[PDB]
Every structure is written in structure tokens, then in C-alpha cells.
Design an enzyme around this catalytic site. Structure first.
Site, PDB file in Angstrom:
ATOM      1  N   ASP A 148       0.849  -1.205   0.000  1.00 33.77           N
ATOM      2  CA  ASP A 148       0.000   0.000   0.000  1.00 33.77           C
ATOM      3  C   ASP A 148       0.881   1.251   0.000  1.00 33.77           C
ATOM      4  O   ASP A 148       1.321   1.659   1.098  1.00 33.77           O
ATOM      5  CB  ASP A 148      -0.901   0.016   1.226  1.00 33.77           C
ATOM      6  N   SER A 190      -0.478  15.653 -12.053  1.00 35.65           N
ATOM      7  CA  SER A 190      -0.729  15.262 -13.444  1.00 35.65           C
ATOM      8  C   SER A 190      -0.905  16.548 -14.287  1.00 35.65           C
ATOM      9  O   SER A 190      -1.462  17.531 -13.770  1.00 35.65           O
ATOM     10  CB  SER A 190      -1.940  14.328 -13.562  1.00 35.65           C
TER      11      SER A 190
END
Length: 330
Positions: free
Chosen positions: A35, A199
Site C-alpha cells: 500500500d 498530473s
């Protein structure tokens, strides 16, 4: 040193991935959910309330010649999905794919929430976010990666998740055979403890690319792609009969649909998520309503590049002094 382990989807939907991990001496093998969005290595154990264990493999510290109680140390964590676990702490030898750490904090669960009990395939979590999020008190502990870092050939790990298929976690090296073209690296903020990056924009299907900054985290422990509501509406508008359902808890679409791809920017590069990756199947057995793999982040407080996004790429988690993320197509 290096390590290389195969990671396998727990079910037909890729809801999560498990990676075998050797704990203790002799080795006890547990299947952990790696994770990148949390920082605790915790396991089902001989200490877990018996009614909260249903099919998981447990760690038994009393059977390990290398186990030592970390006296006075406790942990307690809550995840973004409302799940939780807590307990006490041992140090022990932990190996992933041939890479060994001595004196790793192994957080032994005394209590787990219902969602962990109900998932018999996940024996615990191995956190790979920054050690500043580790929950051990009163002495915060290091992640497996942070403990291994100094011994690794290169201070990196890579995630190469499969679509409906196994993939790989590598530590300490970049497999140049595992991707196509070049890796594009992007800056990381560690201010929130996450692999947090920006992004450069998105496209829906064959549509034009929209240049826009989308701050978010690379999170192997989250199933879906959670993006701003504007972006998510633009995606689902291209699917006839798609809608957001408050009763289901997100966007659903007719199971008869063909889904468009979704592209996200990494600097000047582009990662394409095929439409098939965004199909999470019937909302209930036999339903003709299917659950979408792109959902709104609006109720979360952060955008999350979860497995839907990450499994479309070869991803480098560069843990050098100035951390960075790398993405390649594959």
C-alpha cells in the site's frame, strides 16, 4: 541488494493485489496488500480477537526465534474507506522477494474492522508511503522500504500491476525489459506523507487533451481512480446511460456499454487507461447496472491515482534524497 516479488489480484475485478512476505524464523509466509498510501506493516496474528479472523493466515510471534516485543509500543490506523485496525508491535526479520530487513516493526493486530475480517485473502498490509505517516506510538517506526533503502543497489521500488493478471514489485532496481519507450519522471511532495504529484491533464477516449494540473497521490492500496467531479463528469458523459447514483455510491453505467479509454498526463507524456480497465462489473450479482472505475474525489479531500490508473503503467517510486515518481507505458 535487490528484491523481486510477484503480486496477484485477490479476485476477478482486481479489487486489490497480494504479495507473499516472509516474517520470522523459521519463515511464516503471509500474503500482504502492498500500500503506497500508508506506512504501517501490520498482520493478522495469534493476538487478533478470534471472532475477527475468518480464513486469514496469521503471524505467531511466539513461534519465531527472531521475534522481540517492542515493549510499550502500540498502533492504530484508519483508512480512507472507513476500515481500521490496531494492536501491539514486534520486531522481526522480514523478507520480500529475496530482500531481507532485520529489526522490521511488525504491527500485530489485536482488533481489525469488519472489512478486513470479511476479506480472507489479505493477511495484512505492507505500507510504502513515507515513514512520517507510521502510526506506532510512542516511538514511530520505519517502513520496510525505508529500512531496506541503504542496502539497495538504487533507492527505488517499482510497481508493475497486472490487468486481470499477476504483476511485480521490484526493490532496488529498474527492470528495463518491463516497459516500452522511456520513463517520464515528475516531482513529488512529501508534505502529506504520500507519493503526491501533479498530473498535467487528461483526455476522454479519442477526445482532445485538456491541459490542467491535477494534484493527487499514487496509491497501490486504493482500487479505483478518484478525480475531480469536473473530470469524472466529462468521462461519464461519453457513456450512454451512465449516471451518478447516491444509492449505489458513485457512477454506474449499463453493462451493455463499451467504455472509452481515459488518458492522464505525466509531464509531456501520456498514460492511456483502456476502457476495459474502468469496468468493475455488476453492482450486485445478476444486475445490468455496472460500477465505474473512475469516481469523484469530491468527498475525499484528495485525488487518488489508484490501481485503475497505476496498472496501465510501469511506475517508479524513487526514494532518493529528493523523491520523484516515474511513469512508463508497457
Amino acid at each position: 541488494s535487490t528484491g523481486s516479488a510477484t503480486t496477484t489480484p485477490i479476485d476477478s475485478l482486481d479489487d486489490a493485489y497480494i504479495t507473499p512476505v516472509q516474517i520470522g524464523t523459521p519463515a511464516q509466509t503471509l500474503n500482504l496488500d502492498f500500500d503506497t498510501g500508508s506506512s504501517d506493516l501490520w498482520v493478522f496474528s495469534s493476538e487478533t480477537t478470534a471472532s475477527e479472523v475468518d480464513g486469514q493466515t496469521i503471524y505467531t510471534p511466539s513461534k519465531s526465534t527472531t521475534a522481540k516485543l517492542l515493549s510499550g509500543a502500540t498502533w492504530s490506523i484508519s483508512y480512507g474507506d472507513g476500515s481500521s485496525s490496531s494492536g501491539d508491535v514486534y520486531t522481526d526479520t522480514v523478507s520480500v522477494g529475496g530482500l531481507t530487513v532485520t529489526g522490521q516493526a511488525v504491527e500485530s493486530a489485536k482488533k481489525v474492522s469488519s472489512s478486513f475480517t470479511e476479506d480472507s485473502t489479505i493477511d495484512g498490509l505492507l505500507g510504502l508511503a513515507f515513514s512520517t505517516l507510521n502510526t506506532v506510538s510512542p516511538t514511530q517506526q520505519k517502513t520496510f522500504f525505508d529500512n531496506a533503502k541503504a542496502s539497495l543497489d538504487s533507492p527505488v521500488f517499482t510497481a508493475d500491476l497486472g490487468y486481470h493478471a499477476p504483476g511485480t514489485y521490484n526493490f532496488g532496481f529498474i527492470d528495463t525489459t518491463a516497459y516500452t519507450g522511456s520513463i517520464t519522471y515528475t516531482a513529488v511532495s512529501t508534505k502529506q506523507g504520500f507519493w503526491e504529484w501533479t498530473s498535467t491533464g487528461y483526455a476522454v477516449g479519442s477526445g482532445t487533451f485538456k491541459s490542467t494540473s491535477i494534484d493527487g497521490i499514487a496509491d497501490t492500496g486504493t482500487t479505483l481512480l478518484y478525480l475531480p467531479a469536473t473530470v469524472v463528469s466529462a468521462y461519464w458523459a461519453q457513456v450512454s446511460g451512465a449516471k451518478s447514483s447516491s444509492s449505489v455510491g458513485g457512477y454506474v453505467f449499463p453493462c451493455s456499454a463499451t467504455l472509452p479509454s481515459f488518458t492522464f498526463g505525466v509531464g509531456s507524456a501520456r498514460i492511456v487507461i483502456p476502457g476495459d480497465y474502468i469496468d468493475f462489473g455488476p453492482i450486485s450479482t445478476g444486475s445490468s447496472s455496472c460500477f465505474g472505475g473512475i469516481q469523484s474525489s469530491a468527498g475525499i479531500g484528495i485525488n487518488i491515482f489508484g490501481d485503475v490508473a497505476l496498472k496501465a503503467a510501469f511506475v517508479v517510486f524513487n526514494g532518493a534524497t529528493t523523491p520523484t515518481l516515474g511513469f512508463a507505458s508497457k
